[PDB]
Symmetry: D2
């Protein structure tokens, strides 16, 4: 078992320690080859064929790059080879919980199929990591390379999902606090997962990446902030950090929240819902699970991938007919039709647990002029989109710490005022898109009148008339 070299188009030739190779070469990790990073966005950007697997390799690589760079510049942090391997493992494994079509699964499908459950891809990642470790004999291999599984499994999970409920972490003590800001940074959102997907998604989408993670790594240092060691950026680089969140927002606008990519995601979700009683996934002890229950057994979840779409598409069973017909309509490009768009006024946000009530509100609106067609709640889709800098209404740069060239061990803060008067004054907004499943010209005309009336009833922004 020696170092393996892998050639990635984004990062070039990456070295994998043999413990990481042992983790990668398992059913639970290889599964990520069959889950598209961008889900339905491939049906809009034909270059966006990339899967979660290759992204995970990239995240693991970058996690290793940052921890190594901090260790080389600051030997006093006493970063050990054990620490480095743990950080790489967490980076590699933080996408293990994603389901079919990535964000479609946790963002659209599970909230509709299992409204009572509180599922996140992060919790899924921890559950899947645990299942990976336990099914493949990884603990004794960890010991063989000097990891202490009791402490180090806890550390890896904590880096993925946060404190597993004073210093709240158990995997490492406070003097290694900075290690928890690499893989998933809950304090300000600056972490290696974004860095990989900015570069990788851009390469495949055909949009150029404008953030330079390498530069950020070169300038990162650890300093003491309120009696905790934290990753700090150079003061001068504050503008690049505002630009990094601007880039994320751009990618959301152009690609991840594309109105057609989103309706494709919605149609796939509607097909899974219609198929859910009939697709069977075998889990532990030969028990049978459904698409919506596979999250309750990691053996079954291991086998839940984008394949489910083609299982439905290629089915012949008449019980799957309605589900299959939705997917067939995607192939013919007979999509549910865009009716229009609005925004809430102020800092008003429609919360997730109101999502399912919105189609009935639109259908119950009492429009402008009398109508020939009457539409019902189930004829409307109402897609609520949050665009923000990753910290709800907050400016994430208020939660970054900086150092100056003349005192590189002294952390400081920088306010927005001190940076630039051309920056945004708000950091979150919401867009509401409405679509109609009835596509004839009379239904669509009526759907538009319901929509515009609803906007007026809710005091939302007056829709642009756009087309018509």
């Amino acid at each position: 078992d020696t170092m393996k070299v892998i050639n990635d188009p984004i990062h070039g030739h990456i070295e994998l320690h043999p413990l990481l190779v042992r983790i990668i070469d398992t059913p639970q990790f290889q599964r990520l080859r069959y889950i598209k990073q961008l889900g339905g966005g491939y049906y809009v950007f034909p270059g966006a064929s990339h899967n979660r697997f290759e992204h995970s390799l990239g995240v693991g690589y970058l996690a290793g790059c940052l921890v190594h760079a901090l260790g080389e510049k600051q030997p006093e942090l006493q970063i050990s080879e054990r620490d480095v391997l743990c950080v790489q493992i967490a980076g590699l494994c933080r996408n293990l919980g994603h389901g079919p079509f990535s964000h479609m699964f946790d963002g659209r499908f599970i909230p509709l199929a299992r409204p009572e459950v509180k599922w996140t891809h992060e919790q899924g990642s921890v559950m899947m990591f645990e299942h990976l470790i336990n099914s493949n004999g990884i603990k004794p291999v960890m010991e063989q390379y000097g990891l202490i599984p009791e402490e180090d499994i806890c550390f890896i999970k904590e880096q993925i999902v946060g404190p597993l409920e004073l210093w709240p972490y158990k995997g490492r003590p406070e003097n290694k606090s900075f290690l928890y800001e690499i893989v998933s940074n809950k304090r300000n959102g600056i972490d290696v997962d974004k860095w990989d997907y900015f570069a990788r998604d851009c390469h495949h989408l055909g949009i150029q990446n404008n953030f330079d993670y390498k530069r950020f790594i070169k300038f990162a240092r650890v300093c003491e902030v309120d009696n905790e060691l934290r990753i700090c950026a150079r003061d001068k680089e504050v503008g690049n950090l505002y630009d990094m969140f601007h880039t994320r927002n751009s990618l959301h606008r152009r690609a991840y929240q594309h109105k057609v990519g989103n309706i494709i995601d919605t149609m796939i979700t509607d097909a899974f819902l219609k198929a859910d009683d009939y697709i069977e996934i075998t889990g532990a002890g030969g028990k049978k699970y459904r698409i919506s229950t596979a999250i309750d057994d990691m053996e079954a979840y291991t086998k839940l991938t984008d394949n489910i779409f083609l299982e439905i598409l290629y089915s012949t069973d008449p019980k799957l007919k309605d589900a299959r017909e939705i997917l067939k309509q995607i192939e013919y490009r007979n999509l549910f039709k865009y009716v229009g768009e609005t925004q809430p006024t102020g800092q008003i946000k429609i919360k997730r647990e109101d999502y399912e009530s919105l189609p009935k509100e639109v259908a119950s609106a009492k429009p402008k002029v009398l109508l020939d067609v009457k539409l019902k709640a189930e004829d409307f889709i109402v897609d609520v989109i949050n665009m923000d800098y990753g910290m709800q209404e907050k400016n994430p740069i208020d939660h970054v710490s900086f150092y100056c060239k003349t005192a590189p061990n002294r952390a400081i803060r920088i306010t927005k005022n001190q940076v630039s008067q051309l920056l945004p004054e708000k950091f979150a907004e919401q867009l509401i898109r409405v679509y109609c499943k009835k596509v004839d010209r009379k239904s669509l005309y009526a759907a538009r009148q319901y929509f515009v009336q609803w906007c007026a009833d809710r005091n939302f922004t007056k829709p642009q008339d756009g087309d018509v």
Copy 2:
């Protein structure tokens, strides 16, 4: 309704005429989203996630770029908008016949499952195009945009598969001969399908493309060669054309024939073979097909994609157990082990019908080394790979014609010795790779001794690591020392 613009990572924003959009938006074309361009190469190069779909859009785009450029520089060729659309449709549709994991299917699986049949992805493409046209009402849309379906369907199919039986084509007459050199060029191999996959495979593999197709297009013209209109290159550019085939050969060497990518393809094929008697695919009239017979019914073939690998991998049926276990071993990376590589010396070339005899020959070699373990024929895989410049033994540049700046419509020939002494003297070769299915350290040591002995017995080239893997076998052969 209207023209669509699509953002492709290789070519940027490309325009799709509404007839092309009508062809794209069908189950027969969208199928190509579920077939990986490089098959098992993704299990070696993790960037190589791209599918035949986006390649096909790129081929159609490039076909349109070349035909438009010829028409703009030479209005005297009388290239019509109808011709342009036909050439674009052929470029878009020339990959329709590919099967699961692309070259694995027609290159490895079908030859082993149906040895009596003569299947190519080209014939597949023609059959699938026909099925696409007839199942989706495309003929009246063709008429609406000025095509004459009977004649233009024939032209499109001819551009894909070649003459469908003195001028042998029926789709266009002799004065548009150059149109048959864009999508699939049977005379010299220079066509737009290569240009797309050079750029696209490189972008995703993480290897850089050295050929500039745009430059070639700027310098291409049509001239009369031996009473036929042909696409000719500028004289000066002959070196770039040698380099283009050198690039193709490089991509084969580095990626498409990667020794581990090939063994993964071989293991996937062996899994499909073991699954073939049990997976059912419904086709026309509700008739049932197998993976190996789905090529005989386009309705069934429409539903034969890379999904088959996951159908096998996730199955619970006990009859699929042997097939599923192969794929599981791929996931654990318990792959058949590479033993080594050699080439025939001279002009002898091992023919397909001798492939099955090779594992027995390796196993019957008599290495004079201490061996504990004894291996059998079935413990060895022998993979024979043909590397050439696309025209078997021939130099494809001897089949290109050139023009000079002082007489741009007058075609000439250029010989290899007029270009450079640094160019190849031979244009085809074979590589032979050996692998062992027994993976332990003693089996692999023994497999290496049988291998190197067999090479010496057959007068093949000395393996590159031959002195390290078989130090006691290499001194016997005086040619190697």
Copy 3:
């Protein structure tokens, strides 16, 4: 005298019409090989070795791309081959008036050397174009290719500098109004010069940008707005347009206004000022000009390039000693030292005529700290930088018009609040950087106390490192705590 092909790293293989080749192959155009696009930026970003020449070729190319695209999609605009060539010539020639080190010359040097004169690179380009045309016999070549020089020279100059003198242009009538929005767009700043330098500067600097000009061209059309034909964009593209100006601002912040690039430009300017009495440049009729007067005679200006820096650096004349010493200090990297950066709060714009008073204000600040070393006004440089979206306080997207796909002849406006709440609220600001000419550790410590005190006195923003550089000064200001 047919089409020449040129390989550019940004745009690939570009075609040049023979008239454009005749204009390029003149001393007045080739001069742009010896002027760096980014001036002193090369001394910070070592990839930024590119010259105005190659930028100009790119601008000409893009001007041709946009005008061709509009003419192909909208034949009713009656865009002629003559119009296309005129637009290409204007794009090619709009950088002809640049001086040594590009923006250093018109932005720093000429304002200080000739405070009474009003010089811009645009006026320079018109004067240089006229000199190019008249010295090289271009008018008969223009006629040969169907241009009417009297009208078309006027058109080309107008496209560079704006109306030369109710429809104010004389080169083309109102029905070709949209032609004046390609090369230099004074109405909203969207023109092809930016598109080239975004791509080219990024390629050389080692910074990437996410603006796609090709996409913009696909979605651009000409529509009637308030009885004038204008270039409009598809409604969906509004976000991209905000991003395009965000990218320009980024490039300014990261590269063009780099604090060290600017101090290098300042030191080069100070060297030119010290050399200005002594360098002689021969112009028309053997008359002698200085660096600062060469703008008054295009024959002399033709010979005024970045070479002046090396003429000074390599000189032995004792009268050039002070100038030469400055440049030698640049080579040793003994640069003026950066003290810090602040911004005015509110809508205080510091005006140009107050620039010279700022060093005295910093030096007169009364920091309330033990200061052993004493600094003077002449020890401080104060560089005031205006950053904006190209139309001072205005949002340039308020001056773009957009069309919906289903009504492509109806242009409308889109307001900022209809696009996003996360957009800027202001479109112009100023940065003030302070530097010290005394470079030792004690001088710099003192300079930082003067600086931070001055900021507090003027109610400027708290410098980012303010608490580290001036720990005794920042607590006085309650606004900062």
Copy 4:
């Protein structure tokens, strides 16, 4: 301490403070004013890059390779001192280049100073010595743990080779591998090529297909015939053949472009005409010429591409002939390409025969009605050697490899073990002929002299031979 520089090819590069002290000198900054590709900028408008940025890249890559070897093989005992010395040598190996890079040492000096034997490598050693002594670098070297007597010798040896059994004095035999990084005289594989492949491609608009990072990942040091050498992985042999194929490509497409070369020729002819009259001040106020500035590093420090513009902008009547040549370049009134041929076999025209070739072309007797009659001085004959960096030899015969199963055991690999599609020779010559008389009748006649000369000396048929000289190509049955 460490300075960060953003380079477009390598990204953000760290420079140790000793390297920064070397860079920030007049002797190093000079390289900002010397174009990497000389006259090639007049053909490829992207090729504006200078020797400066290339040098930074070479230093960076030298550091990357030595660090990689030291991290994978701690038993080599590579010290931080060794690393810095290797980086300094990489940074400084281009210091000796002159105006327009290869034009200076390849065309100008051989013609202006035929008695002297000058190379850019010797220039680099002289310039390095001058840089060190004029800028007080020795005490800074000591401050960072270098021993200047030994380490200056090592750096110079890495640039120019052995300065007089193990022939090097800067390091002993157990660090032999250190001398294969910056300039590898045994097989040509070094970091200078790797930088210019990537950088020249970026600026030319041609894409690089060699992956130096991959080579570094697979490089190891093994004992070969009792010497420690840098070896490559056996599998990677194909990539190494491709690396020299890429170099040959870049030469064919760009470095030896027929117009780029004629522009270099015309620039050289201008310098020769200016050489008696341009003065460059050097040490002690002594005056030097363009051709003698190589003898005094203070004057050479001030000899850059500026000399072209000094000539172009001059008014001195003694510079008139030189200035007129350069003005003709601006108007694109260039000497005209007549054609191209190659010697047959392994026949090779030697440098000392170059000047006699125009007389041979002019003395050819074409057998055609010619109104115009041309003389020796109307012809330029440019002889170009294209090879894999070791004359007739295959450079892969001088590479050592290791196998995965015995990474300490070096082996050799022959060409026939790799592929039958590889080149059968590793060197050739191209001969290009140009005419200084540019009218249509002169050029017609020049083509007949040219094609006749080719037939007389059994040379290869010109590619357009049947269109340029339809009445001359029928002589030769090999061509028909």
